[PDB]
């Protein structure tokens, strides 16, 4: 059980991260106009709210820990549950770590005016250091998590307050909503994906649904309030960015938040805001490392991965399964060496939203195959909100496939590599 306000804070903390500080580059480089990027943010938030409600329904139906793995295992089959676990193990969490390490290195270089050639070495060093820190037990990781969660709200609030009162802010800063050079149809998909990365992490509402005290009255209010607060914060931050900088200026830099802070609080305030952004990125990497470490243990304890004994090995000193962390760190380093922030974020969004759309279809199927299950929480408008979430997910998947064949091919190839691993592991019993 958890208090209603406590769940609100949990949702706001998990969803909000370092995407808002860096994704505006992609959003306003694709959209190309101040108004279309804001529309992308709003649409992404609406889709996130609908998906959160839909996922929370099944989370209440199946309160067992694990999340999408458990949901898809129970609805479709064990093979798809393992497929979700494997995709999270080899794409989602490694790519999140790689992308956040790359952006941390980029922001660090910008802050300290170092050469751009040190971005990859930095990213690698910080990823290794954070993984090693997480290997020393949950104490330091929890301390970092709490500190980053507390501190990441300060730069956002400061930027919003300062930019909204910038000398020149006004409705004129949000025009013309479209530039002929960027067609609305093609560019809006890329803008939507870029915004959707900033909303990542909302899938934990389903996991928290089972823990919630009294779903069905607090769960809808909690989810709607938390995701609406996240959407409002993102919209206000983007409005502040547009007040301080133009759409072209935001698209022309890899650190929009740093540039806006430099314009707002010249002197030491810009440096402090940049350090806050770096701390937020650090906390994001740490949280992703923890959540990712939790996955290979779950897969191995069910004898679903090769050398499941090795993966499920528990460290006597810290009582942590380290080997899965090492595998994820290796994959993340490989991604860092041969990847980019925007590309990795797009891949993450593509794979996670494919599986999330599968989860929505699972909710719809459960509403039909097993109408008699005890449902503590029912989605508000069954024929409308799940349909909106599924339409959003399908649009994301198809737009990414059409616009980024290489990224979609990479994700599909990794998952299809996972499949024969599943069959071999079933044959050999771990």
């Amino acid at each position, epitope marked *: 059980e958890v208090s209603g306000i406590t769940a609100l804070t949990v949702v706001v903390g998990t969803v909000i991260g370092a995407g808002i500080f860096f994704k505006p580059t992609a959003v306003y480089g694709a959209a190309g106009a101040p108004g279309l990027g804001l529309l992308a943010w709003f649409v992404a938030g609406i889709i996130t709210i609908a998906g959160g409600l839909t996922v929370a329904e099944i989370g209440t139906i199946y309160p067992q820990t694990g999340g999408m793995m458990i949901y898809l295992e129970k609805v479709y089959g064990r093979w798809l549950g393992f497929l979700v676990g494997w995709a999270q193990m080899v794409i989602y969490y490694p790519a999140n770590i790689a992308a956040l390490a790359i952006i941390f290195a980029t922001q660090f270089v910008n802050l300290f005016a170092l050469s751009d050639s040190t971005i990859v070495p930095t990213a690698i060093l910080t990823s290794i250091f954070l993984m090693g820190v997480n290997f020393l*037990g*949950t104490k330091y990781s929890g301390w970092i998590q709490t500190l980053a969660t507390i501190l990441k709200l300060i730069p956002l609030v400061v930027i919003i307050v300062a930019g909204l009162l910038y000398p020149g802010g006004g409705v004129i800063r949000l025009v013309p909503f479209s530039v002929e050079t960027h067609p609305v149809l093609t560019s809006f998909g890329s803008a939507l994906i870029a915004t959707l990365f900033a909303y990542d992490g909302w899938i934990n509402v389903g996991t928290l649904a089972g823990e919630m005290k009294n779903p069905g009255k607090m769960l809808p209010k909690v989810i709607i309030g938390g995701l609406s607060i996240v959407m409002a914060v993102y919209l206000l931050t983007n409005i502040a960015y547009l007040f301080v900088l133009d759409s072209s200026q935001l698209a022309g830099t890899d650190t929009p938040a740093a540039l806006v802070a430099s314009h707002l609080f010249e002197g030491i305030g810009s440096k402090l805001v940049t350090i806050g952004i770096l701390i937020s990125v650090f906390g994001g990497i740490n949280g992703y490392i*923890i959540s990712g470490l*939790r996955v290979p*243990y779950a897969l191995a304890t069910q004898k679903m991965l090769p050398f499941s*004994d090795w993966f499920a*090995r*528990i*460290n*006597p*000193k*810290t*009582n*942590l*399964p380290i080997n899965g962390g090492l595998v994820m760190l290796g994959i993340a380093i490989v991604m860092i060496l041969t990847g980019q922030f925007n590309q990795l974020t797009d891949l993450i969004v593509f794979v996670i939203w494919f599986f999330i759309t599968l989860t929505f279809i699972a909710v719809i199927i459960l509403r039909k195959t097993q109408p008699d299950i005890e449902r503590p929480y029912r989605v508000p408008f069954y024929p409308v909100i799940p349909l909106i979430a599924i339409i959003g997910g399908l649009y994301i998947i198809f737009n990414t496939l059409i616009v980024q064949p290489k990224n979609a091919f990479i994700g599909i190839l990794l998952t299809l590599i996972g499949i024969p691993i599943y069959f071999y592991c079933k044959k050999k019993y771990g």
Partner: nanobody
Amino acid sequence: VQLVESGGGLVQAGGSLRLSCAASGIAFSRMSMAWYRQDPGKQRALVARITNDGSTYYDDSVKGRFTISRDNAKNTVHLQMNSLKPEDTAVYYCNAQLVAWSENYWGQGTQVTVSS
């Protein structure tokens, strides 16, 4: 989920006590059983842990003297505190945790003190 300890008590320095800890209601074979130390007005500090696969970890201050052993047949864990020393006096708890992020199961806690 109970964890009943025993074996602690007053002992002369340099003695040897074994702290049995019978665990019931948990998947003992799958759990990593540990022994913690909580000095007065402090927080529990790990003394020794043994994983489900037999791998063991010992605190630097007890390494070479303490020996943690588990026997899944009777669902008990022992801690042979050989060559006790006066600073070793504290209250020793019996823990049973599946994984670092799982729920921690604690015993009633046993008091062991070294007279000399």
